[PDB]
Amino acid sequence: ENIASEISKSVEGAIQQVKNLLTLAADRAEQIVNDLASTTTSTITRPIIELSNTADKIAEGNLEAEVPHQNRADEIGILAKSIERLRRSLKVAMESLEEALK
Amino acid sequence: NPAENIASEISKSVEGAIQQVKNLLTLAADRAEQIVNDLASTTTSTITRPIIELSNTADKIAEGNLEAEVPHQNRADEIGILAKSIERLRRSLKVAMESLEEALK
Ligand SMILES: [Mg+2]
């Protein structure tokens, strides 16, 4: 075409290459949400739900099992040790009540 | 105009636009980096703070304060479910302790 078209169109390819890299970056940024939902589920949700279910089983009268994940180094481990304290208190109380029967 | 080369006149004419593109890309990278500290703050307020409060309450109950108020029972997420489980556990232990106290009289 004319000089203005020859010069201006010569940068179109480069601009598309810049856009391709920006599209890859935007797609990678978007992925963070679903990956963070998965990490939260495995790291936090499942252990919290497991601990709540264990607390319910203990409150219902099942004292045979030590509370799982007491050795975990984060706040979930601190919580699991606290629930273990309740389980041990309930176990002592139940054993003393059994010694009082008949 | 002191410019001696058309290649320099044309190529320099887009420098301002290119620097703007780069500055916006630097601002995007800086905004992305801010996500980490924000996510540590969200996790602390949403999860850490109530979990530690629940663990402290569980300890107080195990130590003998059977009347300790279990916080966050009205919460709509899994922390609320956990809090309600600790409340049922407090009720069960309270009954167990009172039953023993009465049996030994
Ligand atoms: Mg018997």
Task: Write the secondary structure of chain B as one string of H (helix), E (strand) and C (coil).
Answer: CCCCCHHHHHHHCCHHHHHHHHHHHHHHHHHHHHHHHHHHHHHHHHHHHHHHHHHHHHHHHHCCCCCCCCCCCCCCCHHHHHHHHHHHHHHHHHHHHHHHHHHCC
Distance CA B102, CA B80 (A): 33
What resolution, expressed in A, was reported for this entry? 1.8
Find the angle CA(B21)-CA(A10)-CA(B5) to the nearest 5 degrees.
85
Locate the domains of chain B by residue range: 1-105
Q: Are B57 and B71 a contacting pair, CB within 8 Å? A: yes
Give the chain A residue whose CA is nearest to the CA of B64: A89
Nearest to A48 among B59, B78, B90 (CB): B78
Distance CA A22, CA A67 (A): 49
Q: Are B50 and B75 a contacting pair, CB within 8 Å? A: yes
How is residue B68 written in tokens?
A: 């300790």
Q: Are A78 and B52 a contacting pair, CB within 8 Å? A: yes
Check: CATH 6.10.340.10 for B1-105? yes
What class is the A1-102 domain? Answer: special
Q: How many CB atoms lie within 10 A of CB B105?
A: 5
- Assign A11 to helix, strand or coil: coil
How was this one solved?
X-ray
CA distance B2 to chain A (A): 22
Q: Name the DSSP class of A2.
A: -
Considering only CA atoms, which of B85, B69, B40, B82 is closest in space to residue A58? B85
Considering only CA atoms, which of B73, B47, B68 is closest in space to residue A40? B47
